């Protein structure tokens, strides 16, 4: 499904991403927007046999297993399909595990480029959550 901006922020809040390890809710809303336009079914293949899945475009070479990616590490111990659900539970859990690494949200290149160091609070600005 394709979330509404505010609808997604409310969900992300319910799922505890707001202020998770020092990252305000805006950061996550902004990241989702630029990564998949709030689309849970979004996918994108890469040069290697890996694919980015879900609202947060999580890679299948290091984070999830789709049973067909060379050098899969499945760090999130989850089937990549779980990241395409209308239920964001799984994508959030994995995102939290990713951001829990030393380099934090810098894992999402799209975040650094268009969200990192910006007034991200703008993304939840206006929402009645």
């Amino acid at each position, epitope marked *: 499904k394709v979330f509404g901006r505010c609808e997604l922020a409310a969900a992300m*809040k*319910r*799922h*505890g*991403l*707001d*202020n*998770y*390890r*020092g990252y305000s809710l805006g950061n996550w809303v902004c990241a989702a927007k630029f990564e998949s336009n709030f689309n849970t079914q979004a996918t994108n293949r890469n040069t290697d046999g890996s694919t980015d899945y879900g609202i947060l475009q999580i890679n299948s070479r290091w984070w999830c297993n789709d049973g067909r990616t060379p050098g899969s*590490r*499945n*760090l999130c*111990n989850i089937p990549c399909s779980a990241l395409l659900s209308s239920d964001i*539970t799984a994508s959030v*859990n994995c995102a*939290k*595990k990713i951001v*829990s*690494d*030393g*380099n934090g949200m810098n894992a999402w290149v799209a975040w650094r480029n268009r969200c990192k160091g910006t007034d991200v609070q703008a993304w939840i600005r206006g929402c009645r959550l």
Partner: antibody
Amino acid sequence: EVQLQESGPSLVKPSQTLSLTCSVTGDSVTSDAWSWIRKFPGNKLEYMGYISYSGSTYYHPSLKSRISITRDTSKNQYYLQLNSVTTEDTATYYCASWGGDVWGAGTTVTVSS
Amino acid sequence: MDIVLTQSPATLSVTPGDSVSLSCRASQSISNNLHWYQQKSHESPRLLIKYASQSISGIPSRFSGSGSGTDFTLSINSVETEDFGMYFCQQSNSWPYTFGGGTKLEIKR
């Protein structure tokens, strides 16, 4: 299938270094982030710190100064080093996956001269 | 400062078959980043509930969790004979991760 097991000196003298090993079996140590958790005498748990799947680390501030966590990708083990111990470091030490889904049986380390 | 988790009551005595509710309060809001652990004597801790209310495949259905922010509850629908021991909550919202002081489930007689 993934299983953890702690091992190391059960006795450490005050001011010396506490060293423990966690052997990861059934899977690669590079296949997850890992932690060290200790249990003091009155059911007081402390999350000492964890080492990511990348090798980077996060140390409990109260210990940031005495603690070091490392890993060995060839032997599939990660370690805990804790300097200048005192009787207060006496506790049951456990290693666990960052997710908390796997835990070693834990091992007691006693600090005494 | 570091997040403080307060669990109550310190100890709870029940008869197998009854239901119980264990409390855990955080000194600061942690949204849903609260996890519940069980630890039986001579055994290592076991994760029962993750992120406040998500169930772990393989954990008996009688165990469930609720709450958000600073107020969380672990519920056991009809405590079973093998359910007695310690119960601790733990937050992963901010570093350092911290544990509550634990609640002890003991048998009533």
